[PDB]
PDB file of C-alpha atoms in Angstrom:
ATOM      1  CA  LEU T   1     -12.490  -2.362 -20.457  1.00 33.05           C
ATOM      2  CA  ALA T   2     -13.356  -6.051 -20.078  1.00 35.90           C
ATOM      3  CA  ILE T   3     -16.316  -5.714 -22.463  1.00 35.62           C
ATOM      4  CA  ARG T   4     -14.107  -3.908 -24.999  1.00 34.45           C
ATOM      5  CA  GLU T   5     -11.585  -6.749 -24.845  1.00 35.82           C
ATOM      6  CA  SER T   6     -14.284  -9.392 -25.309  1.00 34.41           C
ATOM      7  CA  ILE T   7     -15.923  -7.783 -28.342  1.00 37.09           C
ATOM      8  CA  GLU T   8     -12.591  -6.922 -29.961  1.00 35.81           C
ATOM      9  CA  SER T   9     -11.516 -10.540 -29.519  1.00 37.90           C
ATOM     10  CA  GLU T  10     -14.720 -11.910 -31.052  1.00 37.68           C
ATOM     11  CA  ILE T  11     -14.330  -9.723 -34.164  1.00 39.24           C
ATOM     12  CA  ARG T  12     -11.056 -11.558 -34.875  1.00 39.38           C
ATOM     13  CA  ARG T  13     -12.864 -14.896 -34.466  1.00 39.04           C
ATOM     14  CA  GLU T  14     -15.530 -13.878 -36.985  1.00 40.72           C
ATOM     15  CA  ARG T  15     -13.012 -12.501 -39.495  1.00 40.53           C
ATOM     16  CA  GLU T  16     -10.729 -15.529 -39.234  1.00 38.51           C
ATOM     17  CA  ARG T  17     -13.496 -18.138 -39.430  1.00 36.37           C
ATOM     18  CA  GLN T  18     -15.022 -16.426 -42.455  1.00 36.11           C
ATOM     19  CA  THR T  19     -11.614 -15.859 -44.068  1.00 36.40           C
ATOM     20  CA  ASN T  20     -10.498 -19.444 -43.321  1.00 36.93           C
ATOM     21  CA  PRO T  21     -13.312 -21.996 -43.738  1.00 38.97           C
ATOM     22  CA  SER T  22     -10.671 -24.730 -43.430  1.00 38.88           C
ATOM     23  CA  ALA T  23     -11.701 -26.569 -40.255  1.00 37.31           C
ATOM     24  CA  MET T  24     -13.850 -24.417 -37.887  1.00 36.88           C
ATOM     25  CA  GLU T  25     -13.918 -27.291 -35.426  1.00 36.88           C
ATOM     26  CA  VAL T  26     -12.432 -26.361 -32.053  1.00 37.22           C
ATOM     27  CA  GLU T  27     -15.399 -24.316 -30.641  1.00 32.77           C
ATOM     28  CA  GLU T  28     -13.469 -22.638 -27.847  1.00 32.10           C
ATOM     29  CA  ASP T  29     -14.777 -20.755 -24.831  1.00 31.61           C
ATOM     30  CA  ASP T  30     -14.601 -17.031 -24.192  1.00 35.24           C
ATOM     31  CA  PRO T  31     -11.211 -15.330 -24.485  1.00 36.86           C
ATOM     32  CA  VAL T  32     -12.094 -13.023 -21.588  1.00 35.44           C
ATOM     33  CA  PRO T  33     -14.314 -14.388 -18.853  1.00 36.59           C
ATOM     34  CA  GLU T  34     -13.751 -13.432 -15.203  1.00 37.60           C
ATOM     35  CA  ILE T  35     -12.087  -9.976 -15.367  1.00 38.43           C
ATOM     36  CA  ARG T  36      -8.401 -10.027 -14.442  1.00 37.71           C
ATOM     37  CA  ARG T  37      -5.962  -7.813 -12.561  1.00 34.57           C
ATOM     38  CA  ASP T  38      -4.793  -6.162 -15.787  1.00 35.56           C
ATOM     39  CA  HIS T  39      -8.098  -4.345 -16.205  1.00 32.69           C
ATOM     40  CA  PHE T  40      -7.884  -2.966 -12.676  1.00 29.51           C
ATOM     41  CA  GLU T  41      -4.292  -1.863 -13.268  1.00 30.79           C
ATOM     42  CA  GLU T  42      -5.428   0.000 -16.362  1.00 35.11           C
ATOM     43  CA  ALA T  43      -8.582   1.454 -14.812  1.00 33.41           C
ATOM     44  CA  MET T  44      -6.823   2.641 -11.669  1.00 32.45           C
ATOM     45  CA  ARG T  45      -5.050   5.354 -13.671  1.00 30.33           C
ATOM     46  CA  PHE T  46      -8.223   7.342 -14.225  1.00 29.65           C
ATOM     47  CA  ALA T  47      -9.468   7.425 -10.638  1.00 28.77           C
ATOM     48  CA  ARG T  48      -9.582  10.665  -8.667  1.00 25.16           C
ATOM     49  CA  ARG T  49     -10.563  12.066  -5.296  1.00 23.80           C
ATOM     50  CA  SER T  50     -13.814  13.926  -5.861  1.00 25.82           C
ATOM     51  CA  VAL T  51     -13.747  15.560  -2.407  1.00 25.81           C
ATOM     52  CA  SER T  52     -11.092  18.135  -1.581  1.00 25.26           C
ATOM     53  CA  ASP T  53      -9.514  18.751   1.805  1.00 27.99           C
ATOM     54  CA  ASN T  54     -11.075  22.132   2.539  1.00 26.79           C
ATOM     55  CA  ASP T  55     -14.535  20.613   2.175  1.00 26.36           C
ATOM     56  CA  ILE T  56     -13.729  17.948   4.771  1.00 27.31           C
ATOM     57  CA  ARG T  57     -12.258  20.727   6.943  1.00 28.33           C
ATOM     58  CA  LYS T  58     -15.606  22.575   6.666  1.00 29.89           C
TER      59      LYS T  58
ATOM     60  CA  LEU X   1      10.189   8.475  20.118  1.00 26.20           C
ATOM     61  CA  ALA X   2      13.279   6.250  20.065  1.00 27.04           C
ATOM     62  CA  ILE X   3      15.203   8.679  22.292  1.00 30.11           C
ATOM     63  CA  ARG X   4      12.264   8.826  24.724  1.00 29.62           C
ATOM     64  CA  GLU X   5      12.238   5.030  24.940  1.00 29.93           C
ATOM     65  CA  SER X   6      15.990   4.873  25.555  1.00 31.66           C
ATOM     66  CA  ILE X   7      16.060   7.448  28.354  1.00 31.45           C
ATOM     67  CA  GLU X   8      12.928   6.061  30.008  1.00 28.54           C
ATOM     68  CA  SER X   9      14.514   2.606  29.958  1.00 26.75           C
ATOM     69  CA  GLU X  10      17.772   3.837  31.493  1.00 27.80           C
ATOM     70  CA  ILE X  11      15.932   5.519  34.392  1.00 26.99           C
ATOM     71  CA  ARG X  12      14.649   2.065  35.400  1.00 26.50           C
ATOM     72  CA  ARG X  13      18.218   0.719  35.246  1.00 22.43           C
ATOM     73  CA  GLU X  14      19.467   3.477  37.553  1.00 23.69           C
ATOM     74  CA  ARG X  15      16.579   3.096  40.013  1.00 23.96           C
ATOM     75  CA  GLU X  16      16.859  -0.693  40.132  1.00 24.37           C
ATOM     76  CA  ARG X  17      20.651  -0.805  40.472  1.00 24.23           C
ATOM     77  CA  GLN X  18      20.568   1.772  43.259  1.00 24.67           C
ATOM     78  CA  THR X  19      17.574   0.114  44.937  1.00 23.40           C
ATOM     79  CA  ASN X  20      19.115  -3.372  44.583  1.00 22.20           C
ATOM     80  CA  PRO X  21      22.897  -3.390  45.137  1.00 21.81           C
ATOM     81  CA  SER X  22      22.716  -7.199  45.194  1.00 25.94           C
ATOM     82  CA  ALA X  23      24.812  -8.206  42.175  1.00 28.64           C
ATOM     83  CA  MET X  24      25.097  -5.416  39.530  1.00 27.10           C
ATOM     84  CA  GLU X  25      27.125  -7.760  37.357  1.00 24.04           C
ATOM     85  CA  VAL X  26      25.513  -8.370  33.969  1.00 22.37           C
ATOM     86  CA  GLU X  27      26.452  -5.029  32.255  1.00 23.83           C
ATOM     87  CA  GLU X  28      23.995  -5.316  29.387  1.00 21.05           C
ATOM     88  CA  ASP X  29      23.847  -3.344  26.156  1.00 20.44           C
ATOM     89  CA  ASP X  30      21.289  -0.737  25.168  1.00 21.44           C
ATOM     90  CA  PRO X  31      17.608  -1.666  25.425  1.00 24.52           C
ATOM     91  CA  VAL X  32      16.858   0.357  22.286  1.00 23.90           C
ATOM     92  CA  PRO X  33      19.523   0.529  19.615  1.00 24.34           C
ATOM     93  CA  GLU X  34      18.598   0.517  15.914  1.00 23.99           C
ATOM     94  CA  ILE X  35      15.068   2.022  15.806  1.00 23.84           C
ATOM     95  CA  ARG X  36      12.359  -0.528  15.031  1.00 26.28           C
ATOM     96  CA  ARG X  37       9.133  -0.658  13.039  1.00 23.38           C
ATOM     97  CA  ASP X  38       7.055   0.121  16.132  1.00 24.55           C
ATOM     98  CA  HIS X  39       8.335   3.692  16.248  1.00 23.53           C
ATOM     99  CA  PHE X  40       7.392   4.239  12.612  1.00 26.15           C
ATOM    100  CA  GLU X  41       3.942   2.761  13.231  1.00 25.85           C
ATOM    101  CA  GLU X  42       3.464   5.201  16.086  1.00 26.17           C
ATOM    102  CA  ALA X  43       4.937   8.210  14.284  1.00 24.75           C
ATOM    103  CA  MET X  44       2.942   7.634  11.110  1.00 25.80           C
ATOM    104  CA  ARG X  45      -0.245   8.692  12.907  1.00 27.16           C
ATOM    105  CA  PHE X  46       0.817  12.318  13.146  1.00 31.16           C
ATOM    106  CA  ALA X  47       1.826  12.848   9.523  1.00 30.14           C
ATOM    107  CA  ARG X  48      -0.150  15.151   7.246  1.00 30.35           C
ATOM    108  CA  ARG X  49      -0.214  16.514   3.720  1.00 33.35           C
ATOM    109  CA  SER X  50       0.991  20.096   3.979  1.00 35.14           C
ATOM    110  CA  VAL X  51      -0.012  20.937   0.390  1.00 36.58           C
ATOM    111  CA  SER X  52      -3.674  21.036  -0.580  1.00 38.50           C
ATOM    112  CA  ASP X  53      -5.148  20.130  -3.947  1.00 37.78           C
ATOM    113  CA  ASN X  54      -6.170  23.611  -5.063  1.00 38.69           C
ATOM    114  CA  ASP X  55      -2.579  24.784  -4.684  1.00 35.88           C
ATOM    115  CA  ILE X  56      -1.344  22.010  -6.979  1.00 33.95           C
ATOM    116  CA  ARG X  57      -4.199  22.908  -9.355  1.00 31.15           C
ATOM    117  CA  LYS X  58      -2.904  26.516  -9.381  1.00 29.96           C
TER     118      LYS X  58
END
């Protein structure tokens, strides 16, 4: 999810800097370095227990 | 567990006030009113999921 956010943010940078050649001066850093708690909150929805209870009982 | 603690505390009161008739003057309140977090921490060991995963799958 973090990689998706980074690439989808950079596409906007490319489109805006080619659409607007006005200044192109600020040269900012990455929008998403150092993966945040939001990505874990999204990714925690799709987790599951792969081992059932009867297996552990066995 | 709270009831066990209360009765086991009152047995000490009876034994000490009959063993020592010295003053018997203070007339305190209950040792255990208003069940505390310790009883939940003890009772949470014996809990279990009564419904397995294959049943919910069904």
